[PDB]
Motif scaffolding. Structure first.
Motif, PDB file in Angstrom:
ATOM      1  N   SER A 130       1.600 -89.550-111.041  1.00 12.34           N
ATOM      2  CA  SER A 130       2.368 -88.514-111.719  1.00 12.34           C
ATOM      3  C   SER A 130       3.443 -87.993-110.774  1.00 12.34           C
ATOM      4  O   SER A 130       3.131 -87.504-109.685  1.00 12.34           O
ATOM      5  N   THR A 155       5.009 -90.276-115.725  1.00 10.40           N
ATOM      6  CA  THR A 155       3.728 -90.943-115.548  1.00 10.40           C
ATOM      7  C   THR A 155       3.954 -92.444-115.429  1.00 10.40           C
ATOM      8  O   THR A 155       4.503 -93.066-116.343  1.00 10.40           O
ATOM      9  N   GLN A 202      -4.481 -88.872-106.147  1.00  9.27           N
ATOM     10  CA  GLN A 202      -4.310 -89.402-107.496  1.00  9.27           C
ATOM     11  C   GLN A 202      -4.080 -90.910-107.480  1.00  9.27           C
ATOM     12  O   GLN A 202      -4.560 -91.627-108.366  1.00  9.27           O
ATOM     13  N   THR A 240      -3.257 -94.150-111.347  1.00  6.20           N
ATOM     14  CA  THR A 240      -2.161 -93.508-112.060  1.00  6.20           C
ATOM     15  C   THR A 240      -1.348 -92.655-111.093  1.00  6.20           C
ATOM     16  O   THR A 240      -1.883 -92.105-110.128  1.00  6.20           O
ATOM     17  N   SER A 247      -6.698 -93.356-108.107  1.00  2.94           N
ATOM     18  CA  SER A 247      -7.192 -93.444-109.476  1.00  2.94           C
ATOM     19  C   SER A 247      -6.433 -94.458-110.320  1.00  2.94           C
ATOM     20  O   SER A 247      -6.803 -94.677-111.479  1.00  2.94           O
TER      21      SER A 247
END
Lengths: 218, 6, 218
Positions: free
Chosen positions: A137, A186, A130, A135, A133
């Motif tokens: 989480s 986030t 992730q 971002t 990308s």
């Protein structure tokens, strides 16, 4: 317009308790006979339990019983079991030889009272996949607790976070009547890489449990 | 009849 | 056995129309009466209309001006069409012989219709990895984060359905981006992290996308 009014709209009962749900129709049902009771469990389609006011469909536990007459109908659960957590609906059929209608009651949510249980807490860092990308989480899991009320707080390098998390909660488990909850923090990748210590604090009653990790160490 | 509308 | 298989588009634009059908197997739709019912997310059951065994359609007052229920005797199907849709019409739609006074009752599996002008988008699946060296006592937690998809629903299974005990798949939350996210988690004995392979099977039929993610420690 035809209406069916259930009461209560929700109730909380303990295992073994006797539960009663009433359903008042605004006018007589077809042949004073066509009323059924449906059970809907989390994430499932409704399942019929009773038909013709009081006929128990085969395979349904006998602790479910239907009764009533005229425009007053009742569903009774003699001895409530944890798997009986569900929303219950009455449904009537109405009309004449040249008109046919159906109406659902608004539903009755049956919740299972049980003993308090503390959550098992797990924290998950963002995956390397992730992060590519842009971002990040961060996920905090509260597994199998009761009651539903729990306060989850996020800290990044001891700074309390506000407005950047979302929570989701399962419905009562059909076996142990507990809940589980996820809180997802986030952040941008850039922000995530600027800090070291991530922590989720879960407060229930007189106890706060904090799980943490240090970015870069597993 | 088992249902109305017939 | 008898079956009632539902089909029809899930994503529909505001101001447009939905068209759902149900195909019977093991019996004839032209010889029984069938209802259409819908349930908005988190709300109650609402009766739309009824198509008698004789082929006459009767609609609830609210639905009459936008709804049309028909049947194709050759195809052995019943069909619902509703036009001029608005966000308020987003719901799971079912076909059902409700069986209020008869012993025969059958429901389709239900189909979510989302009313939105946004486009379909398949999910990204990221691992929620258990740490190679346990942080807890015996029971480890792992899962998959299913992020940035639209519309609902996705389904998640573990090990192609062989792993069901201890699985918690959370309700989807709508993110500030207008895209959905959810996590599915499972608690397993921590000693099995070296032995057992854990794969989450994510299906997003609206985008004709399936993702299988092997979740490995650290």
């Amino acid at each position: 317009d035809i209406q069916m009014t259930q009461s209560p709209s929700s109730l909380s009962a303990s295992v073994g308790d006797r539960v009663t749900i009433t359903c008042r129709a605004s006018q007589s049902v077809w042949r004073n006979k066509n009323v059924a009771w449906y059970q809907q469990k989390p994430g499932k389609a409704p399942k019929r339990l009773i038909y013709a006011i009081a006929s128990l469909y085969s395979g349904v536990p006998s602790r479910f019983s239907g009764s009533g007459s005229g425009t007053d109908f009742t569903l009774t659960i003699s001895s409530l079991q944890p798997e009986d957590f569900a929303t219950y609906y009455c449904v009537g059929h109405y009309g004449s030889e040249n008109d046919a209608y159906y109406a659902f009651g608004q539903g009755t949510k049956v919740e299972i009272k049980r003993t308090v249980a503390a959550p098992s807490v797990f924290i998950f860092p963002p995956s390397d996949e992730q992060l590519k990308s842009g971002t990040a989480s961060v996920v905090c899991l509260l597994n199998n607790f009761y009651p539903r009320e729990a306060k989850v707080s996020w800290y990044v390098d001891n700074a309390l976070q506000s407005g950047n998390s979302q929570e989701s909660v399962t419905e009562q488990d059909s076996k142990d009547s507990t809940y589980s909850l996820s809180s997802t923090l986030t952040l941008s990748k850039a922000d995530y890489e600027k800090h070291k210590v991530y922590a989720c604090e879960v407060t229930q009653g007189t106890t706060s449990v904090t799980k943490s990790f240090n970015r870069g160490e597993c | 009849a088992g249902x109305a509308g017939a | 056995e008898v079956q009632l298989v539902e089909s029809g588009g899930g994503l529909v634009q505001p101001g447009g129309s939905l068209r759902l059908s149900c195909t019977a197997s093991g019996f004839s739709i032209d010889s029984y009466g069938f209802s259409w019912v819908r349930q908005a997310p988190g709300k109650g059951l609402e009766h739309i209309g009824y198509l008698t065994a004789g082929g006459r359609a009767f609609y609830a007052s609210w639905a009459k001006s936008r709804s049309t229920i028909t049947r194709n005797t050759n195809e052995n199907t019943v069909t619902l069409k509703m036009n001029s849709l608005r966000a308020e019409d987003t719901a799971v739609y079912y076909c059902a012989k409700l069986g209020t006074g008869s012993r025969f009752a059958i429901w389709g599996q239900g189909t979510l219709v989302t009313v939105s002008s946004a486009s379909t988008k398949g999910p990204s699946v990221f691992p929620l990895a258990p740490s190679s060296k346990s942080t807890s006592g015996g029971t480890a937690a792992l899962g998959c984060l299913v992020k940035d998809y639209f519309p609902e629903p996705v389904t998640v299974s573990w090990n192609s359905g062989a792993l069901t005990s201890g699985v918690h798949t959370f309700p989807a939350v709508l993110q500030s981006s207008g895209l959905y996210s959810l996590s599915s988690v499972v608690t397993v004995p921590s000693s099995s992290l070296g032995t057992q392979t854990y794969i989450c099977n994510v299906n997003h039929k609206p985008s004709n996308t399936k993702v299988d993610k092997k979740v490995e420690p650290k």
